[PDB]
Design a protein around this ligand. Sequence first.
Ligand code: CLA
Ligand code: CLA
Ligand SMILES: C/C(C=C=C1C(C)(C)C[C@H](O)C[C@@]1(C)O)=C/C=C/C(C)=C/C=C/C=C(C)/C=C/C=C(/C=C/[C@@]12O[C@]1(C)C[C@@H](O)CC2(C)C)CO
Ligand SMILES: CC(/C=C/C=C(C)/C=C/[C@@]12O[C@]1(C)C[C@@H](O)CC2(C)C)=C\C=C\C=C(C)\C=C\C=C(C)\C=C\[C@@]12O[C@]1(C)C[C@@H](O)CC2(C)C
Ligand SMILES: CC(/C=C/C=C(C)/C=C/[C@@]12O[C@]1(C)C[C@@H](O)CC2(C)C)=C\C=C\C=C(C)\C=C\C=C(C)\C=C\[C@@]12O[C@]1(C)C[C@@H](O)CC2(C)C
Lengths: 75, 185, 171, 177, 162
Amino acid sequence: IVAGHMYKTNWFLGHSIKTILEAHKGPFTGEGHKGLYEVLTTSWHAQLAINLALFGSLSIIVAHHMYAMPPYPYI
Amino acid sequence: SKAVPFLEAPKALDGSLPADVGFDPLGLSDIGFDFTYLMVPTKWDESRTGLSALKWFREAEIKHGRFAMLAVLGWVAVDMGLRLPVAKYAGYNAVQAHDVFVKSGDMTVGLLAIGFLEVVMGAAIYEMSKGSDRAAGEFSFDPLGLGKDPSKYARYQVSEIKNGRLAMLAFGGIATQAVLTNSGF
Amino acid sequence: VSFIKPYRQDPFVGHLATPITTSAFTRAYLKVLPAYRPGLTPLSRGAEIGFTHGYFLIGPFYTYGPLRSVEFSLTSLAAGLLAAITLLLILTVGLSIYGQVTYDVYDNALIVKLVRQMVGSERTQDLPQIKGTSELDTVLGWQKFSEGFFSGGLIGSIVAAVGIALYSTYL
Amino acid sequence: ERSKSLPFLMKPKNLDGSMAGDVGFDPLGLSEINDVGVDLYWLREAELKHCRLGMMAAAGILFVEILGPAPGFPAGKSQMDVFWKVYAEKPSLIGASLAAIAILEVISGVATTQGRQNGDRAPGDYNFDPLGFGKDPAKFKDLQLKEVKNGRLAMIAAAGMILQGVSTHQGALENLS
Amino acid sequence: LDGMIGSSAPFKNFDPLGFAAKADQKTLNKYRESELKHGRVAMLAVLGWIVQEFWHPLYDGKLSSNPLKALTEVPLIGWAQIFVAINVIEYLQNKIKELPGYRPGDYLGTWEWVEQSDEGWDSYQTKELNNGRLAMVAIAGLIVQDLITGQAALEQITAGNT
Ligand code: CLA
Ligand code: CLA
Ligand SMILES: C/C(C=C=C1C(C)(C)C[C@H](O)C[C@@]1(C)O)=C/C=C/C(C)=C/C=C/C=C(C)/C=C/C=C(/C=C/[C@@]12O[C@]1(C)C[C@@H](O)CC2(C)C)CO
Ligand SMILES: CC(/C=C/C=C(C)/C=C/[C@@]12O[C@]1(C)C[C@@H](O)CC2(C)C)=C\C=C\C=C(C)\C=C\C=C(C)\C=C\[C@@]12O[C@]1(C)C[C@@H](O)CC2(C)C
Ligand SMILES: CC(/C=C/C=C(C)/C=C/[C@@]12O[C@]1(C)C[C@@H](O)CC2(C)C)=C\C=C\C=C(C)\C=C\C=C(C)\C=C\[C@@]12O[C@]1(C)C[C@@H](O)CC2(C)C
């Protein structure tokens, strides 16, 4: 719930993901994350790539933590 | 300046505020931080030009003075008796009445009521930051009407701020000494 | 600032000027290595490379060979030394055949200029072309390089065996 | 330019004079909210519903505590605890009342949103004047003011009664004396 | 005490004793080299001091956690290898120093890419210099405290010998 009050939606409050990404440049990375917001807001395939990769990784992490710490009675 | 003559002036203590003598050795009246942002963290309004730290400090000083005056009145009252005409307020001094009443669920009620009033008048402070003509500490509270005759108003202003400074220091002493003029350590 | 730029102001090379390819540390470190150290004959480069390589090659053979010993054994040291020397021989054979099939030159940094000046209307690839101007890029240069590698490998392997024996005995 | 209730505050922009009980008491500027389907219309409808609910609840508590319960109903003088005694013996009454209130509240929300959309219905208006007590104007404004003031007072009263019953587990006038 | 990098807010161009007001460019380059080397060595020394105090996995434990005591417990053949590695590194640094366009403390050769330095590059160089200075003071204090008291950093702090 706390983490949900981060991004600016309809009031003068919160963050703009465009401003966060565009400020993360560096000597080794040129323009940095400039344009990534446009990539992820105009391409469903990029969002699917990120979400599916992290989702599969999360599934594997879930699999590990399941047997590691059994969360159900008599399982 | 008119006090501490070997320091000229802070920078903003021109004299536009009442009870001004120029005493500010540390130059605290020049911080660029608009303390209204401690209330409204964001600019919120596009018309929020900003509030000078000096005006916020004047409002805080007036509020502190009023609080300290009422506080010393109350602390002196409970040293010489003067309990409320109701049960559960027997005699338990002032160094221990605070805790026993925090236990008995009414200091929470006082906190809620004082917070309600503080929120309303802090909305007043925020409107002042937005750019209302209201001056610091001016809640337009003159029911009995001894506030007309602008000369009388200015004299009563300087009187209130000086009395508030005296009461702040006196309350600090009283709480530190645990009272000596009317009770014992 | 940007620490990655096109190499030598050529945006079309398959290379980049990163803080690793063209850093001052990289420059000095590669210029002190025997392969690129200035003032070394090809025989000297080969000798130094062979010494270092035999020196660090005797290690794995002696330590993990088929005749190891948790204590010091002369047989284990001899086995490791012989294996290292034979591996150096195999590497020298590879160097010799590579140099035999790669270059046809006996004096470089000139033939290129001669064919850039006095014309090269011949079968090419010996008069013209010629990749690299180093003395290592000749038939004579590579032969001496291989000879130095082989001799230095033997000497370095023997020196490392002596050092291993001394360390295992007197420590 | 200054709010009538709070002279140290500027007049809240959305509260001019129209609504009954308007004295400019909006220190937090909540009347200017125009998001999450919440505006002055929705806030006024919520205030009127709260006023009516608090009036009914305060009247019910006072009636039951003073004149006693109806025949066949439990006693105890603690209105926050007698509810569980009624539910323990007449659960169907509570369930039917809840279902009726749910249906009426769905209708109320639909009416509020519709009247907000195609402005023809004042906030809190349900055309409920069976006895014709507010037909003519110049009395409707007075009745609106009376209802708003009584509803705010009864809101405060009912919240107090709820908290007193939950904490002290005693009757309202029992706490009074 | 020049347009050199390393001037921060508390004391801009901090040369109270005027060491740089009379020195030429070569002496100032030498001073910057010495300062940067001391700062880097001191940062490493402080980090090692603390980490060794609360973690010494190598040498199968042992090697008493108090520094200036493990200094006399290393096999003394591992001391030789560390010495030789530092020596080879500084030989490479000496070779770097003759590369064209060399800057006093720059062993990465950033002058190859950084022409017309920015404010971020200068600020980061100043950050490195200031951290190095703080680490020099800290390591001097660490060694002196361990000498006079006999306890290490987190040991003296834990007991309360302050
Ligand atoms: C800073 C002001 C202040 C504070 C915090 C207190 C706090 C206290 N007083 Mg007290 N008192 C004060 C000033 C103050 N007094 C003054 C100025 C007088 C003289 C008039 C008294 C006279 C007095 C008596 C005679 C008694 C107390 C008692 C008490 C204690 C019991 C009350 C309690 O539990 O909280 C209750 C909640 C509060 C006190 C919070 C105050 C909330 C107020 C009521 C809201 C309204 C304020 C008012 C409208 C301000 C107007 C300004 C503006 C609107 C124009 C408590 C420790 C009793 C006790 O047993 O003490 C040992 C007691 O018998 N006081
Ligand atoms: C001036 C630097 C310095 C020096 C002289 C020492 C000296 C010592 N350390 Mg040590 N250490 C250092 C920094 C240093 N440390 C730092 C920065 C860390 C944090 C990673 C550690 C972590 C550490 C542990 C965990 C242990 C020691 C231990 C020891 C002792 C045995 C030697 C050993 O195994 O080292 C081991 C050293 C490491 C594992 C990390 C060294 C990494 C180096 C300093 C960074 C790279 C150096 C590079 C080659 C040159 C820089 C390149 C460029 C800048 C020019 C010896 C007294 C051991 C001991 O007996 O403790 C009492 C032990 O178990 N150290
Ligand atoms: C989406 C929605 C509805 C809608 C819509 C539509 C349908 C889409 C139409 C429009 O287009 C939009 C919109 C948004 O309006 C939302 C529904 C509303 C909700 C979520 C309902 C919440 C009601 C909760 C209440 C009112 C509960 C009160 C509890 C009490 C407890 C009483 C006690 O006695 C108990 C039980 C125990 C005792 O010991 C003591 C106490 C504690 C006093 C007092 O009463
Ligand atoms: C230090 C202080 C003020 C110091 C002022 C100074 C130095 C002023 C100096 C000058 O003016 C002179 C001299 C001359 C001028 O020309 C120059 C200056 C420089 C301007 C106030 C302290 C002020 C300190 C205060 C007010 C502390 C209050 C503590 C309280 C009230 C405790 C309340 C309790 O609740 C608890 C915490 C626990 C409960 O169980 C019990 C109780 C006791 C009830
Ligand atoms: C929903 C309802 C009651 C619901 C009660 C519930 C859920 C209670 C459930 C529980 O108690 C139990 C069971 C057991 C407990 O352990 C659990 C709970 C949960 C506590 C009653 C509706 C009751 C509904 C009634 C009585 C409807 C009457 C309708 C009439 C007279 C209609 C007339 C018309 O249709 C004509 C004739 C012609 C049309 O043209 C015009 C009109 C006028 C519309």
